Amino acid sequence: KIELYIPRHCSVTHTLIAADDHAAVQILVPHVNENGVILPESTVYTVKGSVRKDGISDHSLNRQFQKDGFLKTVVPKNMMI
């Protein structure tokens, strides 16, 4: 095949992840049931290296977590875009 692989896409910046990027992470948030016990199913978030080193990863993720429903009111309404 022409491509060597399909590179990951950062969930925060919607930009590619380098093969030499050793600051990028991968946060897995398992789904929880009505009882409140984790499940083998999970959703994967990827954050680029340069995002972390600025102080933005924590706030950027809260935008994604709140959108996906893992948080309820952490991020105010006027800060969601």
Partner RNA sequence: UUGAAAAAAU
Partner RNA sequence: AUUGGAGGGCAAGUCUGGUGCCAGCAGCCGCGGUAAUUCCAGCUCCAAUAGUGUAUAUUAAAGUUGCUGUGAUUAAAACGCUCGUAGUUGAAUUAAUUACUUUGAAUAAAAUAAGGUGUUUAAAGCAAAACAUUAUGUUAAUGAAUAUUCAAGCAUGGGACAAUGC
Partner RNA sequence: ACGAUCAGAUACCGUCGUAGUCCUAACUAUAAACGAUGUCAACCAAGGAUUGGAUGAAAACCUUGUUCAGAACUUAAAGAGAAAUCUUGAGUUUAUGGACUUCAGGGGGAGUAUGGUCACAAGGCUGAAACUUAAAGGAAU
Q: Which residues are near another protein by CB under 8 A?
A: 2-10, 12-38, 42, 44, 47, 49, 51-59, 61-62, 65, 68-76, 78-81
The verdict on 9 binding RNA (CB under 7 A) reads no
Number of residues that bind RNA (CB under 7 A): 4
The gap from C-alpha 78 to its chain's centroid, in whole angstroms, comes to: 21
Residue at 64: amino acid letter: Q
Query: What is the torsional sign of CA 59, 64, 67, 70?
Result: negative
Q: Which stretch binds RNA (CB under 7 A): 3-11, 40-48, 49-57, 63-71?
A: 49-57
